[PDB]
Design a protein around this motif. Structure first.
Motif, PDB file in Angstrom:
ATOM      1  N   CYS A  32       0.840  -1.194   0.000  1.00  0.00           N
ATOM      2  CA  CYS A  32       0.000   0.000   0.000  1.00  0.00           C
ATOM      3  C   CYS A  32       0.877   1.248   0.000  1.00  0.00           C
ATOM      4  O   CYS A  32       1.453   1.613   1.027  1.00  0.00           O
ATOM      5  CB  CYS A  32      -0.945  -0.006   1.195  1.00  0.00           C
ATOM      6  N   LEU A  34       0.703   5.196  -0.307  1.00  0.00           N
ATOM      7  CA  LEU A  34      -0.228   6.309  -0.237  1.00  0.00           C
ATOM      8  C   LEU A  34       0.057   7.317  -1.350  1.00  0.00           C
ATOM      9  O   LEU A  34       1.216   7.631  -1.636  1.00  0.00           O
ATOM     10  CB  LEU A  34      -0.139   7.000   1.119  1.00  0.00           C
ATOM     11  N   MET A  41      -5.085  13.007   3.862  1.00  0.00           N
ATOM     12  CA  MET A  41      -6.018  11.930   3.576  1.00  0.00           C
ATOM     13  C   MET A  41      -7.002  11.657   4.700  1.00  0.00           C
ATOM     14  O   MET A  41      -8.147  11.291   4.415  1.00  0.00           O
ATOM     15  CB  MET A  41      -5.261  10.629   3.265  1.00  0.00           C
ATOM     16  N   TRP A 134     -10.071   6.755  -1.484  1.00  0.00           N
ATOM     17  CA  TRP A 134      -9.131   5.717  -1.075  1.00  0.00           C
ATOM     18  C   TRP A 134      -9.829   4.613  -0.292  1.00  0.00           C
ATOM     19  O   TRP A 134      -9.507   3.431  -0.456  1.00  0.00           O
ATOM     20  CB  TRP A 134      -8.007   6.329  -0.245  1.00  0.00           C
ATOM     21  N   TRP A 435      -4.158   4.432  -7.354  1.00  0.00           N
ATOM     22  CA  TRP A 435      -5.065   5.386  -6.733  1.00  0.00           C
ATOM     23  C   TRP A 435      -5.685   6.276  -7.801  1.00  0.00           C
ATOM     24  O   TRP A 435      -5.172   6.392  -8.917  1.00  0.00           O
ATOM     25  CB  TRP A 435      -4.318   6.269  -5.735  1.00  0.00           C
ATOM     26  N   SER A 436      -6.800   6.917  -7.439  1.00  0.00           N
ATOM     27  CA  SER A 436      -7.250   8.157  -8.080  1.00  0.00           C
ATOM     28  C   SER A 436      -7.431   8.001  -9.588  1.00  0.00           C
ATOM     29  O   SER A 436      -6.682   8.570 -10.386  1.00  0.00           O
ATOM     30  CB  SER A 436      -6.290   9.304  -7.763  1.00  0.00           C
TER      31      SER A 436
END
Lengths: 483, 37, 249, 249
Positions: A32, A34, A41, A134, A435-436
Motif C-alpha cells: 500500500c 499512499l 487523507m 481511497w 489510486w485516483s
C-alpha cells in the motif's frame, strides 16, 4: 474445499491457505503506497430539482450497503420467512403451530436485523472518512480477493534521508517511518470490520529501526528491546484505537505480523531485536496459567541474505515469512527460495512488473524521465534502477515484446504473465495498489474506475488465481531464457 | 562454586546452536582431562 | 573528457573573476549536493549560481537533469531547479507561468532574502518572491549556457550524450570554440552567431585556460582548461541584465 | 575517462588522510608545474608525493614520462623525477647505479634537509643523500604505483595509451578492480595477486569514492571517484618500509 470467495468470483478451486495457525493469507498481497500524506487523507470528507441522480447517497451507499453482513442477513431472513410461510400454508395441521412459532422467531430476527440495517445506514453518513476515494479503493480491493495488505512507501534510497536517518528531538514521540500508512490502514480495517466480518481484513506491518541513530548505538541491547517494545505499543495504538485494543475477556488481541527490515549487518546484528520480538510473540507460561499474553502473532523478515536468514533460523527465532525481490527479469535471490522451501517458510515476491513498467505501453517508448515525471509508475528512479540492473532499455524492450507475445497467445494482459510466473516459482506476489482513477492499473486493466464500465467486477482476471498454470512449456522456456 | 557448563546454555535458553570461537575467552567451558586447552 | 563539471574546479578557476562562495557554504555544498542528487533520480546535479539578497541570506541555486534529448532541431535538457539559503537543505524552485514571468520582468533591484515576501504590481497583482527568482534564473539560463563546441555528440535513440573522443577545441581563444548547450552538436551555430559585443574572452596560452564572460549578464563566467579538458560555468550576482549595454561598450 | 590526474582533485580527495600541502606551496605548484613541464619537454608531469625531512623543508617530488612502451612483458615508463624544497624551483633526480642502489637500502631514518648530505656506511663508503632519496622513490614506485584496471590499452607499435572508452570499474570495493601501472593490459595481474593483507580499501557507496591505502608503505594513498571517473594517488610521509607486517595485522 476451495476458497468460497475465489470460487464464485473466478471459478477457482484454490483452497485457502493460512500464514499462521490463526490468520489467513490471500493469493496476492497488496503493498500500500499512499498517493498523498495521511494528514491530507484523514481530513477528506465524502459529505458535500428535488432529486439528484448524481448525488453520492443514491450511488455509493447503495453499493457499499448491500455488501454488509446485516443486509445479507436481512435478505436471507426474508427468504426463509417467505419459504416457511409457504410450507405452513401448505401443511395446516398440528405441525403448523410449531412452524408458525418458527415464523414468529424469524419475524423477531428480521426486526433486529432491520434495526441493525438502519444503524449501519446511519453509520454511513455520520463519519466523513468513509466512502472517500481511497476507502472505496481498498474496499473494492478487499472484495476482489486480496484481503492481505502490507505497509510500504517511497523507501531507501528514493525518499527523504533526513526522515529515515535523522536524529529527532528528544520531545518527539517514538514514531518511525511508515507511520501514517499504519494509521490509514487501521482506519480502513476498523471501518471494514464494522461493516462486515469480525476479522476479515489482515494487515502485515513493517518495523524499520534506525540502527544508525545515536540512541541505538550508545544504548545497547536494553535500548533495542525498549525501542521494539515501544514500537509494538505504538503499532497496537495505531491498528486498534485507544478503545477496543483489548478483548472483552481482558486478554489483549495481538497483531497479525511484524516484518523486520535491517539496514546494515556489519553495524549491528539483529539478534537482540529478534529475541525480543520472539518473546513478545510467545506467552510466558507460569505453572498451567498463561502470563504475559502474546502481542504479536508472528515474525517475518525483509530482504535478509540467505546466510543471515540461516543464522536467524539457527538461533531459534520462529520466522514465518520472508519477502524478497524476485521477478521474471530479476532472479538475484535464488538461494533464499531454496532455503525457504527446505525450512517450509512462506516467501513474498516484491517486484514482478518492475513497478508497472511491464504494462501495455513502454512497448517502443523512450525511457521515463524523473524530472519530467511519470505517473503510471510508482517510483521513476526505482524503475530506472530496475532497468539498469536488467541491462538497459533495449533488453527490457525485447523482454517486454516476448512477454506481450506470450500474453496475446492466451488473451491476457502483459502483467498477469509475470505475476503467474512469480506464483509458479512458489513465492507470493506483492503488487502495489493504485489510486485516483488509476485503480486496478497494477493488474493492467484500464478505464476501470467507474461502475458503468466495471459493473462491479474486479480488475483482475481468473488465470492469475488458478491452481493450474496457463503457461505452456514453450512459454516457460521463453521466460526462463529471458533471465 | 562450580560454574555451569556452557553447554547447558543450549537447554536453558532453548537456543539450537552455540559457537565459542575462543574457549580461552569463555569461562563456563569444561575440560574433560582437567588441563586448560 | 569530463563527465560532469567539478565544483571545486569551477571555484578554483573563477576565483579571479570574482565568482566566490563562502567557506561554510562550500563545505555544505560538498556534503549536500550528492544527497539531493540521489534523493531524486537525477544523473547530474550541480551548483548553478548564487544570487545576492538584501538581508544577507544569499540564494544558492542548483540545477539538475537526467537525460539530454534532441527535439525540434535543438537540444532540450529537461532541468529541475533547487534553491537554498544555507548549503544544507535544498528546496524546490517551482516553475512560473507566462504572464507571471512577464510581470516578473518589471521588478528591479535585488530581491530580499525572505522567500515569504510579496511584491505589488499593477487592478493589483501579488507576485511571490520565489516566482521572481525562478523568472530571473530561467532568463539567465536561456540567455547564456556555454559548453565547448562538439564536446557532445548524438547517438542511437537520438540522445545528446558526452563525446568521449573529444579532441579538444582548436583555437580556444575565439568564440567559435564555444556554443550554447541548446544548439545541436552537428549544427554550426556557435557563440559567434549572437550579438557582436555581448561576450568577452581572455586566454592564457601557457597554462592553456580560457575565460568567457557574458556582458549582457555581467555575472556569468565560464572556464575551459585545455590541458585537462575541463569546462565549467557559474553565475554570481542578482539576476539583472544591463540593458544600457551599448553606452558601456 | 581522464587522461592525467589533477593536482587539485588529488589534494582535495586526499586531504582527510593528511596528504596535504601548504597553501603557499600549492600556489607555487600551480604556477611552476607547467614551467617545468615545458622546460623538460614532457607531455605528462604530475606531483608524485612529498617526503618528510629532519627540517621543515620537505622534498616535493614530481614524476613525468614522455614515452611508455611494452618491453619483455613489462609496461616500461621512461620516467623522470624532479625534487624541490619549495614549490617554486625544481631540480633533477639522476638515476642510481646498482652498487649504490644496494648500498642505499641499508640506510634508515628520516632524511635531513640539505640534499648535499653524505652518509657514511661500512673501509668507509660515502653516499649522497639524493641517491638515498632516489632509491626510496624507486622502491615506493615499484611496490605501490597503482591505477584502475583497463584504464590503459595497447595500440600499434606496442605503446600503452589511456583507454578513452574506459567506462569505469564495477565493484570498486574489490582490490581486483585495481592494478599496478607496470602490468600489461592483457595480463590479469591485479593487487589481489600481491600479499593478502598489504592493501586496505574503504569505499563510500553513497559518494562513490573508493580509497586504497598501502599498509606495507603506510604513507601511500590512492583515491578513485566513480561517478566521475577520476583517480589519483599521493605518497606523504617518510619513505621507509614497514618490515614487520605480520605482527601488526
Amino acid at each position: 474445499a476451495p476458497d468460497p470467495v475465489l470460487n464464485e468470483l473466478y471459478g477457482s478451486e484454490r483452497p485457502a491457505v493460512e500464514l499462521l495457525p490463526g490468520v489467513p493469507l490471500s493469493p496476492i498481497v497488496n503493498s500500500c503506497w499512499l498517493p498523498a500524506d495521511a494528514k491530507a487523507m484523514l481530513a477528506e470528507s465524502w459529505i458535500p430539482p428535488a432529486f439528484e441522480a448524481a448525488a453520492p447517497e443514491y450511488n455509493e451507499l447503495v453499493r457499499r450497503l448491500a455488501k454488509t453482513a446485516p443486509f445479507r442477513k436481512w435478505n436471507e431472513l426474508t427468504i426463509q420467512a417467505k419459504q416457511l410461510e409457504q410450507e405452513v400454508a401448505g401443511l395446516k395441521g398440528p405441525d403448523a403451530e410449531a412452524k408458525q412459532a418458527e415464523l414468529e422467531n424469524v419475524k423477531v430476527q428480521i426486526a433486529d436485523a432491520e434495526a441493525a440495517v438502519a444503524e449501519v445506514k446511519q453509520s454511513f453518513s455520520d463519519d466523513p472518512l468513509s466512502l472517500t476515494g481511497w476507502m472505496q479503493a481498498l474496499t473494492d480491493l478487499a472484495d476482489g480477493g486480496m484481503t492481505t495488505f502490507e505497509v510500504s512507501g517511497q523507501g531507501w534510497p528514493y525518499c527523504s534521508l533526513r526522515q529515515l536517518f535523522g536524529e529527532m528531538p528528544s520531545a518527539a514521540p517514538p514514531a518511525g517511518f511508515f507511520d501514517g500508512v499504519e494509521r490509514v490502514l487501521g482506519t480502513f480495517k476498523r471501518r471494514y470490520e464494522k461493516e462486515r466480518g469480525p476479522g476479515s481484513v489482515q494487515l502485515m506491518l513493517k518495523l524499520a529501526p534506525n540502527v544508525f541513530s545515536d540512541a541505538w548505538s550508545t544504548g545497547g541491547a536494553p535500548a533495542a528491546v525498549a525501542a521494539v517494545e515501544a514500537y509494538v505499543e505504538r503499532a497496537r495504538a495505531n491498528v486498534f484505537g485507544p478503545d477496543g485494543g483489548v478483548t472483552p475477556e481482558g486478554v489483549p488481541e495481538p497483531l497479525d505480523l511484524v516484518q523486520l527490515v535491517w539496514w546494515d549487518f556489519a553495524a549491528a546484528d539483529p539478534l537482540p531485536v529478534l529475541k525480543a520480538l520472539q518473546r513478545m510473540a510467545t506467552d510466558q507460561l507460569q505453572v498451567v496459567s498463561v502470563s504475559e499474553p502474546k502481542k504479536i502473532r508472528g515474525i517475518g523478515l525483509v530482504d535478509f541474505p540467505a546466510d543471515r536468514l540461516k543464522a536467524a533460523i539457527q538461533a531459534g527465532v520462529p520466522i514465518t515469512c520472508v519477502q524478497v525481490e524476485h521477478s521474471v527479469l530479476v532472479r538475484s535471490a535464488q538461494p533464499v527460495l531454496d532455503l525457504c522451501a527446505k525450512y517450509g517458510i512462506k516467501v513474498l515476491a516484491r517486484g514482478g512488473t518492475l513497478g508497472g513498467l511491464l504494462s501495455a505501453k513502454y512497448l517502443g517508448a523512450p525511457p521515463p524521465d524523473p524530472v519530467r515525471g511519470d505517473a503510471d509508475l510508482d517510483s521513476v528512479p526505482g524503475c530506472l534502477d530496475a532497468v539498469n540492473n536488467v541491462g538497459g532499455w533495449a533488453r527490457l524492450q525485447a523482454a517486454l515484446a516476448v512477454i506481450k507475445g506470450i500474453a496475446d497467445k492466451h488473451g491476457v494482459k502483459p502483467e498477469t504473465v509475470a505475476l503467474r510466473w512469480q506464483i509458479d516459482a512458489g513465492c507470493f506476489p506483492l503488487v502495489t495498489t493504485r489510486w485516483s482513477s488509476r485503480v486496478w492499473r497494477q493488474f493492467g486493466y484500464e478505464g476501470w474506475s467507474s461502475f458503468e464500465v466495471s459493473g462491479g467486477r474486479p480488475g483482475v482476471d481468473g488465470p492469475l488465481f488458478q491452481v493450474e498454470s496457463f503457461l505452456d512449456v514453450e512459454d516457460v522456456r521463453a521466460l526462463a531464457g529471458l533471465a | 562454586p562450580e560454574p555451569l557448563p556452557y553447554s547447558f546454555r543450549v537447554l536453558d535458553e532453548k537456543l539450537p546452536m552455540l559457537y565459542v570461537p575462543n574457549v580461552a575467552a569463555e569461562e563456563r567451558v569444561k575440560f574433560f582431562r582437567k588441563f586448560p586447552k | 573528457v569530463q563527465l560532469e563539471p567539478n565544483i571545486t574546479l569551477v571555484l578554483k578557476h573563477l576565483a579571479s573573476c570574482g565568482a566566490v562562495v563562502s567557506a561554510e557554504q562550500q563545505a555544505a555544498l560538498d556534503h549536500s549536493i550528492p544527497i539531493k542528487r540521489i534523493e531524486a533520480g537525477l544523473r547530474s546535479l550541480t551548483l548553478w549560481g548564487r544570487l545576492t539578497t538584501l538581508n544577507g541570506k544569499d540564494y544558492l541555486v542548483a540545477e539538475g537533469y537526467n537525460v539530454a534529448s534532441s527535439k525540434e532541431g535543438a537540444a532540450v535538457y529537461e532541468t529541475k531547479y533547487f534553491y537554498s539559503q544555507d548549503g544544507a537543505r535544498w528546496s524546490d524552485l517551482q516553475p512560473v507561468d507566462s504572464e507571471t514571468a512577464t510581470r516578473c520582468a518589471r521588478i528591479k533591484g535585488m530581491l530580499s532574502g525572505d522567500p515569504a515576501k510579496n511584491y505589488e504590481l499593477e487592478l493589483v497583482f501579488q507576485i511571490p518572491e520565489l516566482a521572481v527568482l525562478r523568472c530571473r534564473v530561467d532568463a539567465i539560463a536561456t540567455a547564456t549556457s556555454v559548453i565547448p563546441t562538439d564536446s557532445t555528440i548524438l547517438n542511437a535513440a537520438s540522445q545528446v550524450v558526452p563525446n568521449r573522443l573529444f579532441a579538444g577545441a582548436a583555437y580556444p581563444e575565439k568564440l567559435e570554440s564555444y556554443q550554447h548547450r541548446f544548439s545541436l552538436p552537428g549544427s554550426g551555430v556557435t557563440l559567434s552567431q549572437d550579438l557582436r559585443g555581448t561576450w568577452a574572452v581572455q586566454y592564457d596560452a601557457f597554462k592553456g585556460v580560457a575565460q568567457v564572460r557574458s556582458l549582457l549578464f555581467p555575472g556569468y563566467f565560464f572556464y575551459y582548461a585545455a590541458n585537462e579538458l575541463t569546462w565549467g560555468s557559474l553565475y554570481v550576482g542578482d539576476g539583472l541584465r544591463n540593458n544600457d549595454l551599448i553606452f558601456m561598450l
